[model samples]
Target: IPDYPMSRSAGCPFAPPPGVMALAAAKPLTRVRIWDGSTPWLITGYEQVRELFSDSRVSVDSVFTADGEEHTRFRRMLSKPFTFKRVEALRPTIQQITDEHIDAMLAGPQPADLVAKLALPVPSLVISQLLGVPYEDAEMFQHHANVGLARYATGADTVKGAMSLHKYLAELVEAKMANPAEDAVSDLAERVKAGELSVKEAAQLGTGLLIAGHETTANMIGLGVLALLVNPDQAGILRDAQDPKIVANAVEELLRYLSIIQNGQRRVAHEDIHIGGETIRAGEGIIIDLAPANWDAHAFTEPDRLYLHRAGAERNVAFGYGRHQCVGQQLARAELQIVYRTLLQRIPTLTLATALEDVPFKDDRLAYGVYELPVTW
Candidate 1:
């Protein structure tokens, strides 16, 4: 296969790269060459993707060994704030933030860029509050986040952003340890005080959450609104949804349709494993592409269509699958469900200010979304 990270089809940018879709059509797995000139297994089928995600043999850690403790320890430390009960308890706050942004957008001028007024701020502020960081620091962190999420980020680009944020969070960790608050940073501070984690480890995990917590959801919000604008009938369903369950499922369908994390989930095999009639040797790299898996016709009927009522859409791997799956997914779901439904209801006449073909999609970014969704009501 040619080098990986292929572009999506020019004719249908919402779909996965045409080449990848073609590969999935032919088989579940294929050897694709990446930027590093290494051929790794690219798993595209839904079942295969889930299998690899759950398999103990597959790992995101570079030094992954059988029964590794470091990754598990780090993951457990970060999992508390994202627990089911914790996330559920946060719904009211999420909704409050969503309403405040929507109000600001409404009070503003025409041709409002949703990406700026609503998409970015809502998540950024929510995450800031979650991390116990002051809302005033959001813009600085957002700048670093953009650098980290850039598709072609270099060593300097990533290192600079990571270090800056790491330093900021490290300071926050110290402050929280002195006078803790009820937030993620405080949670990490507790662990640091307990000697289970060093200040560096706490800051590293906090910085990771700071990046992942907002960026992906921001992209999803921008792209999702653009999608609903294009598909008016689907937008209407969400706008008029009286049943919370219907709105919840609609968010899932949108997630399946968008699959915003453009880059494949990166992992490596810890042991020789046979899958899809092929053997992957230990130490081989793996890239599981979730978009194509969500689009696999074997899993859903007419996978290309974005039907809000589509059954089984909730099973999509947009947040990924298994142990390494996103820790902030429920929080994201809460934001999406509220934002989509509320935005549609509040601005029923919302329409694009520019031509559909003219909208600039974030093809150059690590995540798929619009750079600016110019809309008017």
Candidate 2:
């Protein structure tokens, strides 16, 4: 039997793992062996993924794997700040941040690593500022976050990453308590001050945001640039796009092009569910691989193409579907639109300092991105 998880084929940095895609092409659902040698149902068809994600029988639960009313409550509370209203309000600030990073990159050395100078810090600093943590201290959390990004993290690695971030976030909470700011951490600090939660407890929440908020966008930026570079015609489309909607569409296409969330969306069926000509019985495990599902040819035309204005692009399940869809989608889209369009237009002459294939890809990491994107304009 085929295994649950596998790497992309050698030299195909942007494609889904050949094994997985082959299985997907052959059938929407297949049985695959997982870490414990248990065969789980892997859903790769776009329609099936959509169906399973929203299926009530699946254990797609609350704020922290929770279900029903509890999940709805948290979504209302936590998702308020993440709404398009607030995200659009944040657009101008993100644009300025993107421009500043591009300015710095332009002023720096000829062969700059886009990952380090531009991609990594852009999202890190944004999340930092939003969380009321100083951008100067971004490196501290970033280092710990880096370790956490490792796909094959050992127990020691996981412990150290979580522990140090916990310590750092606790310190941030303590500082915010003394001097509040108009950011998320300040809210935590207020809770700490009100005796609602301890400094360490607030730190736990902040630590989760620090890790979750920044890294995924940073990876997307890194890989997005590389993909745009490879498709100059598409890059030109973005660069010349005057309509804000066009820029937004480009980001969606890229998100669909490289659904970087590698780890499958996992759920257990509590009741029998039938779809895609398969009966997923109660107690069976379900894994939905976003990467391949986004590439489903039946879902999108020329699935391999980095289509900037592809129709049905919004239908891509890059952020998954249903109530459990990523709450941060609006925020992420805001960043990518600003970053990709601004970077390309600002440095119209930007070209790869190293060959595309030679650019070291972050294959061993949970997020798909290039470690070092050497470039010159």
Top-TM-score structure, candidate number: 1
Which residue pairs show collisions in model 2? 61-66, 62-66, 62-67
Model 1, residue 63: C-alpha shift (Å): 12
Give the range of the ten consecutive residues with the poorest summed lDDT in model 2: 74-83
Cα lDDT of model 1 by residue, 188-263, tens digit: 9999999888888788778767677676899889899998998999999999988888899999999999999855
What local lDDT score does residue 6 receive in model 1, on the 0 to 100 scale? 85
Query: Which stretches of candidate 2 lie above 4 Å from their native place?
Result: 60-64, 134-162, 171-181, 186-201
With candidate 2 superimposed using the best TM-score fit, by how many Å does residue 273's alpha carbon deviate from the native? 0.9
**TM-score of candidate 2 to 2 decimals:** 0.89
lDDT of each: 0.84, 0.80
TM-scores vs. true structure, each candidate? 0.91, 0.89
For model 1, the stretches where C-alpha displacement exceeds 4 angstroms are: 61-67, 134-164
Model 1: number of backbone collisions: 0
- Give the Cα RMSD of candidate 2: 3.0
User: What number of clashing residue pairs does each candidate have, in the order they appear?
Assistant: 0, 3
What is the per-residue lDDT of model 2 for residues 171-267, given as tens digits with 9 covering 90 to 100?
8888988888767777778777876668876787677566666768888998899998888999999999999987888899999998888655578
